[PDB]
Amino acid sequence: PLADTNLFKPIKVGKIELKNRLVFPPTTRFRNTSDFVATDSMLSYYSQRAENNGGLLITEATFGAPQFGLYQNGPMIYTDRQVEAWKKIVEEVHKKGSHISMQLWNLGRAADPKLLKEHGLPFLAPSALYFSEESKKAAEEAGNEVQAMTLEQIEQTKKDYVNAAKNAIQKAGFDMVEVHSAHGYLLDQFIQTTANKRTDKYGGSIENRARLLLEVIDLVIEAVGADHVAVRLSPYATFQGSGGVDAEVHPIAQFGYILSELERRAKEGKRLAYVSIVEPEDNSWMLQIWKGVVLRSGGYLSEKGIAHLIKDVNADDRTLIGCSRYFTSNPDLPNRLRDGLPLTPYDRSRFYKIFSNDGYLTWGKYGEPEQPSDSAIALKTPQPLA
Amino acid sequence: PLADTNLFKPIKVGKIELKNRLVFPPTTRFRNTSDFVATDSMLSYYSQRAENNGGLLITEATFGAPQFGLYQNGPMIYTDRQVEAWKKIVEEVHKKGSHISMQLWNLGRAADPKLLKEHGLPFLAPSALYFSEESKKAAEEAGNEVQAMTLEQIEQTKKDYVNAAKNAIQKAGFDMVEVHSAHGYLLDQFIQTTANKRTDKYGGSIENRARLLLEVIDLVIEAVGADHVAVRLSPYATFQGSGGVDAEVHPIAQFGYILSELERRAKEGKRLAYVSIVESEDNSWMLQIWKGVVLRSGGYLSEKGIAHLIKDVNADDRTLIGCSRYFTSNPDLPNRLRDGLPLTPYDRSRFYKIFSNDGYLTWGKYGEPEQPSDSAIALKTPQPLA
Ligand SMILES: Cc1cc2nc3c(=O)[nH]c(=O)nc-3n(C[C@H](O)[C@H](O)[C@H](O)COP(=O)(O)O)c2cc1C
Ligand SMILES: Cc1cc2nc3c(=O)[nH]c(=O)nc-3n(C[C@H](O)[C@H](O)[C@H](O)COP(=O)(O)O)c2cc1C
């Protein structure tokens, strides 16, 4: 039972008032159309998690533009249809009494090179380096080999971030827009020494490696306001060739500088809505630098993560707790954690089941059974919302 | 009783085998002659602190050269008489079975401008900034105003560090030489954004502000070897205008970069003898970055620090514990801490009493009385060891 704790104490984030501090972190599921349009399945998916919640939801990582991708059946906030669909999802989430932020995705050297090629797009990264020999062979066989971004492509990346942020906040009505700068995707690639060998002002130092992220953040803040902006960082992660603690420059220095710059912008009157961090190594130093709302995610609902949930959410008055994997299998997770009711185990084998309701909408509420793989919803084909 | 803890477990530091991990941190006392030569009182002082100890003694912050000073009756390892006196002290310390390091001092904008003036020396800093209006005042009346160092004064500084290091290690026989890069003196002034406004290679970035320290470190490494070199850092200190956590760039990023670079030199086969550190402020990130011997100092004997002493010294097998203020009172502090014997209180009013044995050699070992100020030892005028 966690109703006793700060986890269900209201908190002001940005300009909105969250009823609790439990967050659904961005969780990629690939239930969009092949056109990258949000579906009715996704609408019900976020609707059930906005019901009886009052808290914050964060969308699956969403491509800001075609060049920001691509993965098959991923999300996008680019075309008119996509913005319409996401707008309807937002309107339903708000009707439910919850709030929602959209995380913006940019793959970089992590993208599907064949799909990008079929959409006539190059395969871009800070430097012409692959994170694995597997990816190198994949890009070479697709005829779409990785390229170091030109200055023009970086400028276009910034403009695309601005356009996607405006579409999310102003057209679709999201409460925040979250810049995905973690897990070895494009912005992280610019941050990481392992991925960034550039010798212009976007590489070669801590300030230079963090430059693209900070410029995107500044342009987006100018576009939609700091209280509608967020960012996610993963200093210790080694996913997709990121250096973690093994980087030639320690992540405490690099990401320490990033956090210092965000806190400086906050000291100049541009305070981000929140900074999202992944629990491992210890994140305490991060909380030393950033003084605003911090969303901490990872492990908190395991058979040992509990009582670090209590400790961390009660440690101060600015901490949000994110639970992703159990939120996928528990659409009523806020009430189950509120009342201390047993959780439904999550099923990793259906995390990325492309364009299928099986393991996506088959989960029941507390005390209700899991619908089987041959049920009506499990075999119903998702339909685009616009 | 602390004999059971790691505080009294042997440990290898550099080439040296320390029988315990209690350390006498560098403690300025100003009992040298007016021409900065070590003194017989100092020999008896360090000698008493070397008996029944076997630990590491760290010498009072010592001027590497006349330009590195100046303070009244401060120490220096520049002239042949000075090196010979310090050699006598080192021979006595080794004879008594303990080991000793010399900390090298460079005042910069913290110096006495009147004294420097009287020695025909300028008043140097990274930038033409005083740490206080009082210092500005004393400098302007002595007609020795602060000057931003030229490139050749920087080069001469590094050469002087090399010369002082070779003097201490190879001639005087010190076990290691510690570079003072803390508490707002010259190297810290280069590190701090509050004091370093340089636009050249030595300022305007994390890497640029740390450049002089790392260059000096590398040169001294080349001179005397890595296991004969150490460094002290005070990321949180705000002494003499240092920025602390209020710096434009957070000290976790800056000193995080410094520690990452030192650990990088360790990865390449040049592992410093130890890193000396001072102390939501918390030095845990420092231990996340630096993996070698770390000497932690500050406040460890308050009956609120005894627990932090046991905790920090037992947390791993590479932690030394420094105790300065109580070591000034208890020349047999190793035995007292080893057997839980009550400590003689310290007298700050005689910490900096110039050229006097009173409150310097009047301390008795456990079970003996403090000699009064009219005793034979207290009235003696100290003589140079030359
Ligand atoms: C299937 C799946 C998809 C995810 N997608 C994203 C994503 O798109 N963006 C992101 O920042 N994190 C993503 N994550 C990481 C989660 O947001 C979260 O940080 C991680 O699962 C740890 O939290 P947890 O222990 O509560 O599950 C994903 C995780 C999973 C399991
Ligand atoms: C009188 C006095 C002189 C000191 N001189 C130096 C010095 O020359 N160099 C230095 O790095 N620290 C110096 N320190 C700081 C100590 O080395 C130590 O970090 C500080 O006193 C905290 O340790 P403690 O709590 O055990 O006393 C001095 C401290 C005192 C009280």
Side-chain angles (χ1 to χ4, degrees):
Chain A
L2 309 187
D4 281 72
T5 69
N6 277 5
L7 188 66
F8 289 97
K9 183 179 178 263
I11 184 182
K12 176 154 205 239
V13 183
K15 262 182 287 254
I16 63 173
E17 190 77 11
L18 303 180
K19 189 177 177 180
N20 60 50
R21 313 186 184 184
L22 171 69
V23 180
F24 186 19
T27 308
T28 292
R29 304 301 305 278
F30 295 136
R31 263 70 172 193
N32 304 262
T33 63
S34 70
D35 247 12
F36 317 111
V37 182
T39 56
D40 52 350
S41 302
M42 295 170 55
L43 185 36
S44 173
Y45 173 83
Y46 289 101
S47 175
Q48 299 178 38
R49 289 156 179 79
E51 183 190 37
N52 300 323
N53 191 349
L56 179 67
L57 308 178
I58 308 181
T59 73
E60 52 206 272
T62 295
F63 304 138
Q67 188 63 70
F68 281 29
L70 291 165
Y71 293 141
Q72 57 186 311
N73 301 81
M76 197 178 291
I77 191 82
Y78 188 71
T79 70
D80 284 355
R81 291 178 57 241
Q82 300 160 359
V83 175
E84 299 166 59
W86 277 120
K87 184 183 192 296
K88 294 173 173 190
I89 293 185
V90 175
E91 291 175 351
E92 170 70 5
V93 166
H94 285 154
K95 185 185 175 189
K96 273 307 162 48
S98 296
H99 319 262
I100 187 166
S101 167
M102 164 170 281
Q103 190 193 49
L104 291 186
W105 214 2
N106 195 330
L107 297 187
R109 72 181 187 177
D112 187 338
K114 174 183 172 69
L115 185 59
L116 282 176
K117 173 106 173 179
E118 296 173 356
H119 287 82
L121 296 161
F123 188 44
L124 305 180
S127 299
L129 302 173
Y130 304 92
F131 65 83
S132 67
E133 293 287 337
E134 181 181 313
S135 174
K136 175 168 180 294
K137 189 96 171 77
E140 285 178 354
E141 288 181 3
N144 202 17
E145 287 173 54
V146 71
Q147 312 195 37
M149 294 186 64
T150 66
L151 272 162
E152 171 59 29
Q153 291 172 322
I154 295 174
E155 292 289 306
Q156 191 60 50
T157 294
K158 307 153 94 183
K159 300 182 183 168
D160 290 346
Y161 269 106
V162 174
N163 174 69
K166 288 169 64 66
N167 290 344
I169 297 301
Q170 296 163 358
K171 294 193 177 185
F174 287 94
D175 299 282
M176 300 96 173
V177 68
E178 174 179 326
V179 171
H180 192 342
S181 186
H183 296 146
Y185 298 102
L186 184 76
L187 311 194
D188 198 34
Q189 298 161 27
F190 272 84
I191 298 173
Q192 298 290 339
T193 55
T194 53
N196 190 344
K197 315 297 179 188
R198 300 180 73 91
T199 54
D200 59 12
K201 69 167 177 176
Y202 288 101
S205 73
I206 298 174
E207 297 81 358
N208 288 5
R209 284 185 295 269
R211 184 172 314 281
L212 197 154
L213 171 65
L214 292 180
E215 292 181 343
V216 170
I217 294 303
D218 292 340
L219 282 167
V220 171
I221 286 178
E222 172 167 66
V224 301
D227 36 27
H228 302 273
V229 182
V231 65
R232 187 169 223 193
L233 304 164
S234 64
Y236 293 112
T238 53
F239 186 63
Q240 287 176 148
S242 289
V245 293
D246 291 312
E248 157 204 358
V249 177
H250 201 277
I252 289 178
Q254 181 71 67
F255 297 85
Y257 165 83
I258 294 176
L259 290 174
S260 180
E261 282 293 290
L262 300 179
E263 183 65 29
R264 174 168 77 81
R265 283 155 174 79
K267 288 178 174 177
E268 291 168 1
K270 307 185 307 145
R271 164 81 66 184
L272 296 184
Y274 62 93
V275 173
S276 184
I277 71 176
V278 166
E279 295 303 299
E281 302 183 352
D282 192 285
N283 284 339
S284 58
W285 58 271
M286 306 187 76
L287 290 235
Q288 281 195 231
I289 306 172
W290 174 254
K291 304 295 188 177
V293 176
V294 54
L295 163 62
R296 312 183 67 168
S297 298
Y300 279 116
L301 281 186
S302 67
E303 297 77 6
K304 169 70 76 60
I306 280 277
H308 276 119
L309 192 162
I310 311 299
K311 188 193 188 80
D312 292 351
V313 81
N314 285 342
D316 56 39
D317 207 37
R318 49 83 171 249
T319 299
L320 308 176
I321 297 292
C323 306
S324 166
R325 283 174 283 190
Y326 279 106
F327 225 138
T328 65
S329 60
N330 299 84
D332 57 343
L333 183 69
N335 284 349
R336 293 202 213 195
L337 294 181
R338 180 198 65 193
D339 309 331
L341 308 163
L343 277 46
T344 302
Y346 56 84
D347 186 6
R348 162 168 289 280
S349 73
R350 277 123 107 235
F351 283 173
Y352 306 110
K353 206 175 208 289
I354 289 171
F355 205 56
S356 174
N357 293 340
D358 186 23
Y360 188 79
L361 291 178
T362 44
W363 308 106
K365 303 230 199 280
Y366 165 74
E368 292 172 353
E370 180 197 12
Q371 296 254 235
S373 295
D374 61 350
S375 57
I377 13 96
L379 297 173
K380 206 206 305 280
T381 319
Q383 302 288 329
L385 293 165
Chain B
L2 285 307
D4 262 35
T5 70
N6 280 348
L7 186 63
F8 292 95
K9 284 299 186 310
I11 186 181
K12 187 193 298 173
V13 181
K15 296 162 173 174
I16 305 308
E17 183 71 17
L18 305 187
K19 309 88 178 89
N20 67 71
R21 301 171 197 196
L22 172 65
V23 174
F24 188 15
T27 302
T28 292
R29 303 299 302 279
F30 297 134
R31 266 73 175 189
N32 307 262
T33 56
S34 52
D35 59 335
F36 322 115
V37 184
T39 200
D40 54 347
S41 303
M42 295 169 58
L43 188 142
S44 173
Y45 174 85
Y46 289 103
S47 180
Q48 292 177 56
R49 276 146 189 84
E51 303 188 24
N52 299 122
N53 183 351
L56 179 65
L57 271 41
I58 305 187
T59 234
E60 57 205 83
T62 297
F63 301 143
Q67 188 54 74
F68 281 38
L70 252 12
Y71 284 149
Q72 253 197 111
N73 299 75
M76 194 178 293
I77 189 137
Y78 188 73
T79 72
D80 280 22
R81 291 183 52 241
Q82 292 162 357
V83 178
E84 183 49 53
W86 280 118
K87 181 182 188 218
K88 296 257 180 64
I89 289 182
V90 173
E91 293 175 333
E92 174 85 333
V93 169
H94 287 156
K95 182 185 297 183
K96 295 301 178 178
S98 294
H99 319 266
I100 184 164
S101 174
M102 164 166 283
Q103 194 194 44
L104 298 176
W105 214 4
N106 196 330
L107 299 186
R109 79 180 186 174
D112 187 342
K114 175 190 216 338
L115 197 169
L116 284 175
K117 174 81 180 191
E118 285 164 357
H119 283 74
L121 296 167
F123 185 44
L124 305 179
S127 301
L129 287 175
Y130 301 100
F131 71 85
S132 66
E133 291 273 339
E134 244 171 30
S135 176
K136 171 161 143 55
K137 139 63 211 171
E140 293 182 344
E141 260 160 41
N144 202 19
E145 300 179 23
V146 68
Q147 295 266 82
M149 272 179 172
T150 59
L151 279 164
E152 184 46 52
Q153 288 170 331
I154 287 164
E155 293 295 310
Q156 188 59 45
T157 297
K158 306 190 314 192
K159 283 177 189 169
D160 292 343
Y161 271 108
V162 163
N163 176 75
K166 289 170 57 58
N167 285 348
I169 296 303
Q170 301 167 347
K171 300 201 183 190
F174 284 95
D175 296 276
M176 47 274 287
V177 283
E178 175 176 323
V179 175
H180 194 336
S181 185
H183 295 146
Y185 298 104
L186 183 76
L187 298 190
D188 194 32
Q189 295 160 30
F190 273 82
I191 296 172
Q192 298 287 344
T193 46
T194 53
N196 188 342
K197 310 298 185 182
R198 300 182 72 95
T199 56
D200 75 353
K201 325 309 159 281
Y202 294 99
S205 80
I206 290 174
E207 298 83 354
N208 287 349
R209 285 186 296 272
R211 183 172 310 281
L212 180 54
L213 170 66
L214 297 181
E215 287 183 355
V216 166
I217 288 298
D218 288 334
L219 294 179
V220 177
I221 298 305
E222 174 166 7
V224 299
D227 41 14
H228 292 287
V229 183
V231 64
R232 194 169 211 196
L233 304 162
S234 64
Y236 292 109
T238 57
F239 188 56
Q240 292 170 331
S242 289
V245 301
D246 290 324
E248 275 227 79
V249 175
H250 197 280
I252 294 179
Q254 177 71 61
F255 295 84
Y257 169 80
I258 291 178
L259 295 172
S260 176
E261 279 297 278
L262 298 176
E263 182 65 30
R264 184 172 72 93
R265 284 150 176 81
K267 299 172 189 292
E268 312 188 350
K270 297 154 290 159
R271 158 89 55 185
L272 277 36
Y274 60 93
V275 169
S276 180
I277 69 169
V278 174
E279 256 216 330
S280 64
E281 300 183 354
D282 192 312
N283 289 341
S284 49
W285 55 272
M286 308 191 75
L287 293 205
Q288 289 198 234
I289 302 176
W290 173 252
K291 299 293 190 173
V293 181
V294 60
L295 162 68
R296 310 185 66 174
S297 299
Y300 275 123
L301 303 160
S302 60
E303 266 54 52
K304 270 198 149 215
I306 305 286
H308 289 118
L309 193 164
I310 299 177
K311 174 157 205 130
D312 294 348
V313 81
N314 286 346
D316 51 41
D317 197 47
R318 47 82 172 252
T319 298
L320 308 177
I321 295 295
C323 300
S324 173
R325 279 170 290 179
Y326 274 107
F327 229 138
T328 68
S329 288
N330 306 263
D332 60 345
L333 192 60
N335 282 7
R336 301 206 193 193
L337 296 183
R338 186 180 60 122
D339 302 332
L341 307 172
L343 273 37
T344 305
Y346 56 80
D347 181 16
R348 309 189 206 249
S349 71
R350 286 175 295 176
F351 280 176
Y352 306 111
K353 186 168 187 105
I354 304 296
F355 207 56
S356 172
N357 294 341
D358 188 18
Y360 187 73
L361 297 177
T362 48
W363 304 109
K365 280 59 166 215
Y366 178 79
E368 301 302 337
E370 178 191 11
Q371 291 193 72
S373 298
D374 50 16
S375 62
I377 185 66
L379 296 175
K380 289 189 187 74
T381 301
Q383 303 296 114
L385 292 173

